[PDB]
């Protein structure tokens, strides 16, 4: 009954917002990451790192504001406030992109904090820790896209910037440069995300239209008591319906709910792997057989060759402004262009 | 086009001409589809987390449920008690009907908007 | 020396067979284009 | 098309090896009951 057990007592008290030991790591880091993003998007430019305006103060709106990445010349500097680049000058720190690493790093430790929180609360309440396990997929996505991907490239500059339109640019960049839509690891992520959303909607719909009549009103919500032992909808009728509509149906409620964990979690894990490859420019860019034929046979055309032309347009037309440290000067005559346009 | 790369061609041409990424109805679609995947994972993990012990370590817990049993197979108050503490109490459903209706509405409405 | 007490029967039901065969066949359908390249 | 010649065996073994595994497990499950 020393100080440690007294502290444990206090951290674990049943209050409106549970704290726990995990709170010590979660709550400062979540607050700071959130605070850095709101601070940067309200007040901080990207003029010196990107040549872009990116704050409300500069005239941007909610869709175009960003906390942008540091300049390619910072390499993978941690950009600590007290480090050799900003040298403890807060103002320079902001202008050099220091809020980006601030948000990325504090965000990473907040995600650790939150997953520890799912572990902590689950242990105290007495449940299996599957919600924490499921959260491993958001974590894998965050570290692979925000940390591993730029670490493989020349600098943080090519990580995503924290903003709505800036993430849109990130999407289009991955199309034009990595041909990311062609990557089977992304396709598995797509099937996992769309598979989840489908499962989500089809499971909620099914339950709501196989409800038992347990009250008398036209509002069926009131006819449920969270301590009742009885299932509130007919699994038997749901199984018949889907067996006759679709051919197969769930028959085991445990499998069904496990499957709902499995599908989107797996999907996200798969896309993270493909992003790890893209850190190295290990793209699924081409099909060699398609290119050998196309080079030799100028009448051979597929949707595959049509999409690479688009990629080549994206690269040449956005590169000068999207990578300003490279001083790309493309005179009009070198720009790839179809007829008239 | 009815094809995998044909689909991607459609998307790239569509973005160039309609700036669909910057359209609110696509953004709600992404929210319907990201949120759908999120709540799929959440709901699957909360129910799986609160399965009532019915089996040994050597067997799939799935055999703890028999098709057509009348009793529920998980403890929804334990699930509510975990999730209400993970966030805060009133940010959690204890009404299974409101919950499953929520699960139905979010991706359906989001995909309506993106359509 | 007695036989080993730690041995256990192993099972795969028909539904898991169908699920797994579906997984493998679609995974093959997805990657085969890339293997042929 | 000038496809990778080992793509065929890659694909055939990629299907055959895990499928056979599942079939072995399923059939010996059925002869238990």
């Amino acid at each position: 009954r020393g100080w440690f057990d007294i502290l444990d007592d206090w951290l674990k008290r049943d209050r409106f917002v549970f704290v726990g030991w995990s709170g010590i790591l979660l709550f400062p880091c979540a607050y700071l990451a959130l605070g850095g993003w709101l601070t940067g998007t309200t007040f901080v430019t990207s003029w010196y790192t990107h040549g872009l305006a990116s704050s409300y103060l500069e005239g941007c709106n909610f869709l175009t504001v960003a906390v942008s990445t540091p300049a390619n010349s910072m390499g993978h500097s941690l950009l600590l406030l007290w480090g050799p680049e900003a040298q403890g000058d807060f103002t320079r720190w902001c202008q050099l992109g220091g809020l980006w690493t601030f948000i990325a790093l504090h965000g990473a430790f907040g995600l650790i904090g939150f997953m520890l929180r799912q572990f902590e609360i689950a242990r105290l309440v007495g449940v299996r820790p599957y919600n924490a396990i499921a959260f491993s997929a958001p974590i894998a996505v965050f570290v692979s896209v925000f940390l591993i991907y730029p670490l493989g490239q020349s600098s943080w500059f090519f990580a995503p910037s924290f903003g709505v339109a800036a993430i849109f640019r990130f999407l289009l960049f991955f199309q034009g440069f990595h041909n990311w839509t062609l990557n089977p690891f992304h396709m598995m992520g797509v099937a996992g995300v769309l598979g989840g959303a489908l499962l989500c909607a089809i499971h909620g719909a099914t339950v709501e239209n196989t409800l038992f009549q347990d009250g008398e009103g036209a509002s069926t919500f009131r006819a449920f008591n969270p301590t009742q032992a009885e299932e509130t909808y007919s699994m038997v009728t749901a199984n018949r319906f889907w067996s006759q509509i679709f051919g197969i149906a769930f028959s085991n409620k445990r499998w069904l709910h496990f499957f709902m964990l499995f599908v989107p979690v797996t999907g996200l894990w798969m896309s993270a792997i493909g992003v790890v490859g893209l850190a190295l420019n290990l793209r699924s860019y081409d099909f060699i057989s398609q290119e050998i034929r196309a080079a030799e046979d100028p009448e051979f055309e597929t949707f595959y060759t049509k999409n690479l032309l688009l990629n080549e347009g994206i690269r040449a037309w956005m590169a000068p402004q999207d990578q300003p440290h490279e001083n790309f000067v493309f005179p009009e005559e070198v720009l790839p262009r179809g007829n008239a346009l | 086009p009815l094809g995998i790369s044909g689909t991607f061609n459609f998307m790239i041409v569509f973005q160039a001409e309609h700036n669909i990424l910057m359209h609110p109805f696509h953004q709600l679609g992404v929210a319907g589809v990201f949120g759908g995947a999120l709540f799929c994972a959440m709901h699957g993990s909360l129910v799986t987390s609160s399965l009532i012990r019915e089996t040994t370590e050597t067997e799939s817990a799935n055999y703890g449920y028999k098709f057509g049993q009348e009793e529920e197979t998980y403890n929804i108050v334990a699930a509510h008690g975990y999730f209400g503490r993970l966030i805060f109490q009133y940010a959690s459903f204890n009404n299974s009907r409101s919950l499953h209706f929520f699960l139905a509405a979010w991706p359906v409405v989001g995909v309506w908007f993106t359509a | 020396m007695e036989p080993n007490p730690n041995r256990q029967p192993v099972e795969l039901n028909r539904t898991s067979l169908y699920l797994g065969l579906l997984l493998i066949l679609v995974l093959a359908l997805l990657f085969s284009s890339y293997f042929f390249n | 098309m000038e496809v990778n010649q080992l793509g065929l065996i890659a694909t055939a073994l990629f299907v055959l090896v895990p499928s056979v595994f599942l079939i072995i497990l399923y059939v010996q499950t059925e002869s238990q009951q």
Binding site: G247, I248, S251 | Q69 | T15, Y18, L25 | -
Partner: peptide
């Protein structure tokens, strides 16, 4: 050979559909 391979896999998936629907383990009540 790659066309044969693609169509072979696809046909195996359709046959599996047949068996998964018509030769499923029947769900029995309680």
């Amino acid at each position: 050979m790659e066309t044969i391979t693609y169509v072979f896999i696809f046909a195996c998936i359709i046959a599996l559909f047949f068996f998964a629907i018509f030769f499923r383990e029947p769900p029995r009540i309680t």
